[PDB]
Write a structure and sequence with these properties.
The chain is an alpha/beta fold and 496 residues long. 19% of the residues lie in helices and 19% in strands. The chain has an eight-stranded parallel barrel with strand order 1-2-3-6-7-8-9-10, surrounded by five helices. A four-stranded antiparallel beta sheet has the order 13-14-15-22, with helices on one face. The structure holds a molecule of 6 linked components (GLC-GLC-GLC-GLC-GLC-GLC) (3 copies), calcium ion and chloride ion. The site of a molecule of 6 linked components (GLC-GLC-GLC-GLC-GLC-GLC) has 10 residues, from loops. Its cofactor is Ca(2+); chloride.
Amino acid sequence: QYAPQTQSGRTSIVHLFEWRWVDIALECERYLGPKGFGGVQVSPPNENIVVTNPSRPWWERYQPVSYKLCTRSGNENEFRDMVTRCNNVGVRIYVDAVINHMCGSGAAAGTGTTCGSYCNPGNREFPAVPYSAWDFNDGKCKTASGGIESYNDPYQVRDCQLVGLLDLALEKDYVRSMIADYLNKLIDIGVAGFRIDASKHMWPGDIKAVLDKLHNLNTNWFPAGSRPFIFQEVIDLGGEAIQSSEYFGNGRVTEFKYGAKLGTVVRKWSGEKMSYLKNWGEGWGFMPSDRALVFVDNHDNQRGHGAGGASILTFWDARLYKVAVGFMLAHPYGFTRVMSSYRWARNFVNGQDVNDWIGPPNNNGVIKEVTINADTTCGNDWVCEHRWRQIRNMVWFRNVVDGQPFANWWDNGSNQVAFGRGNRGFIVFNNDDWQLSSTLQTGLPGGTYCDVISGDKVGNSCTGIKVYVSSDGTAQFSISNSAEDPFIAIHAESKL
Ligand SMILES: OC[C@H]1O[C@@H]2O[C@H]3[C@H](O)[C@@H](O)[C@@H](O[C@H]4[C@H](O)[C@@H](O)[C@@H](O[C@H]5[C@H](O)[C@@H](O)[C@@H](O[C@H]6[C@H](O)[C@@H](O)[C@@H](O[C@H]7[C@H](O)[C@@H](O)[C@@H](O[C@H]1[C@H](O)[C@H]2O)O[C@@H]7CO)O[C@@H]6CO)O[C@@H]5CO)O[C@@H]4CO)O[C@@H]3CO
Ligand SMILES: OC[C@H]1O[C@@H]2O[C@H]3[C@H](O)[C@@H](O)[C@@H](O[C@H]4[C@H](O)[C@@H](O)[C@@H](O[C@H]5[C@H](O)[C@@H](O)[C@@H](O[C@H]6[C@H](O)[C@@H](O)[C@@H](O[C@H]7[C@H](O)[C@@H](O)[C@@H](O[C@H]1[C@H](O)[C@H]2O)O[C@@H]7CO)O[C@@H]6CO)O[C@@H]5CO)O[C@@H]4CO)O[C@@H]3CO
Ligand SMILES: OC[C@H]1O[C@@H]2O[C@H]3[C@H](O)[C@@H](O)[C@@H](O[C@H]4[C@H](O)[C@@H](O)[C@@H](O[C@H]5[C@H](O)[C@@H](O)[C@@H](O[C@H]6[C@H](O)[C@@H](O)[C@@H](O[C@H]7[C@H](O)[C@@H](O)[C@@H](O[C@H]1[C@H](O)[C@H]2O)O[C@@H]7CO)O[C@@H]6CO)O[C@@H]5CO)O[C@@H]4CO)O[C@@H]3CO
Ligand SMILES: [Ca+2]
Ligand SMILES: [Cl-]
């Protein structure tokens, strides 16, 4: 449940948010496999309701109507093809499992659904599963509105409707079994694990009873007896009634404190500074490393009013975002997920983006293909952060240094910091408003190394900055505060 089941030596996954299955299959072969990525988190592959007010938002995909594999990302054949092809080049697929609820209680009855299934939300009828009224928690929720009125009461949080979504009676074996049958179909197809959506809104015990029904992973790609990787979405920034430790028995948990705090530090808000990161990880009150799934932003909080609020760093804030993603990927804490986004027209009204609903790039509702430019960037308003040099090389950095201890920390008492990973990697940051120019101990063997932030090692040369390390492990690092990327990283595989 805790082991990611990636190929040996691969240490991150990427959220290819709202990508079509055919484009993910191609990306696995032409890019993710060759560049050392461990796997992909995909958008929910099961049938959802069609929302027309507003027009096809991203979040319609968190409103299930059946477990048929039929969505705007593609159909069941295309999903299978993607899983097979990705696994065949060593890139695992992790599914976003939406299991707490079905669609909105206020939605109209009919067949406005991604595969044409019928449903009647008002009467709690979902004949394509099938579910009926007694498979929901309406009788169990004690609030007058039927919704969550206080997050201080763990019963309401779990038994009542999250933003009006019909809440499944997860205590019942019939419901646990219908969900297990869906997840087991995906496992047998070749999926490696699951994100469990909205885990805060289910009882840890109910989740566990579903997980105990799951198959071992498919032996065409995994060793016999392998269990699916499980990571649960629980938002707990501390001082809440529900704690992320309640879920540790089932698998890993999203550590949302990580991006919220790192965002604040890198922006230098609330008196925070990078020198405080010396004891990052458990030292900051975070969950144990072997239970954590970490990330700078996710698909919800990149829109600026989720967990972390305005502190969250995203691709819109590109320069600081790269700094935060770089720090994350170099630091040993947690298992890392990299975000991959699309661009939308932000429209702020009272510090609130009123266009935060906008769905992926589309022609009249049909998701646009991911086009690849000659310079390796993406077209059609797909951002492709995972293709940015600074991000892809730090993904490789994490592979190269896997297993090596945190070492050789240095700071200037303010916002210049450095550290290494054993004798295989070293990274240096300048987030201060003045020049960094210092000779630091790197822990690496003497030689000339390419900086993998400003360039690449190509043949026997570097395309960006070169760092000469003395026989005693020291090197000079010079970084201006006006550098495009105010950080440098070198590792064992970037040595000439
Ligand atoms: O009246 C025009 C409208 O008619 C039809 O909408 C149906 C819809 O198909 C039904 O399912 C139902 O809608 C329910 C929702 O199911 C329920 O969730 C809730 O909706 C709230 C929304 O969730 C929330 O986003 C907000 O909606 C805003 C919306 O974001 C704006 O974009 C704007 O919506 C306009 C649409 O963009 C436009 O296409 C058209 O919509 C048609 C729709 O295509 C058709 O299927 O006009 C609307 C209105 O300008 O404004 C809305 C409203 O502020 O808030 C809503 C409401 O709380 O509740 C609704 C109502 O039951 O019923 C409608 C028919 O009323
Ligand atoms: O496909 C959905 C569902 O649709 C229909 O259910 C209707 C039904 O037509 C109506 O008669 C009425 O329900 C009746 C029952 O007919 C009657 O038996 C009794 O309910 C009791 C049951 O005898 C008892 O077993 C229990 O039902 C369990 C059931 O054993 C579980 O399997 C699970 O039910 C699921 C079914 O397995 C599944 O096939 C389908 O059911 C059809 C059904 O065939 C069809 O007639 O879905 C349901 C869940 O979606 O859980 C239930 C709940 O425990 O419940 C009681 C024992 O106290 O009396 C009711 C009168 O309400 O209305 C339903 C619509 O809800
Ligand atoms: O149609 C359903 C729903 O779909 C979409 O919800 C998205 C949303 O865009 C994401 O931001 C996220 O929602 C998070 C919240 O960020 C998080 O805070 C929490 O939700 C709590 C709210 O923070 C809190 O304010 C309160 O919500 C009230 C809410 O103020 C009321 O307006 C009412 O909700 C209605 C919405 O106004 C209406 O638009 C629609 O909901 C959409 C939503 O617009 C859309 O973005 O219908 C509901 C009808 O009730 O009531 C609730 C009180 O229940 O408390 C909630 C907790 O209930 O958690 C959510 C979940 O992640 O993700 C969802 C997609 O799931
Ligand atoms: Ca629930
Ligand atoms: Cl998440």
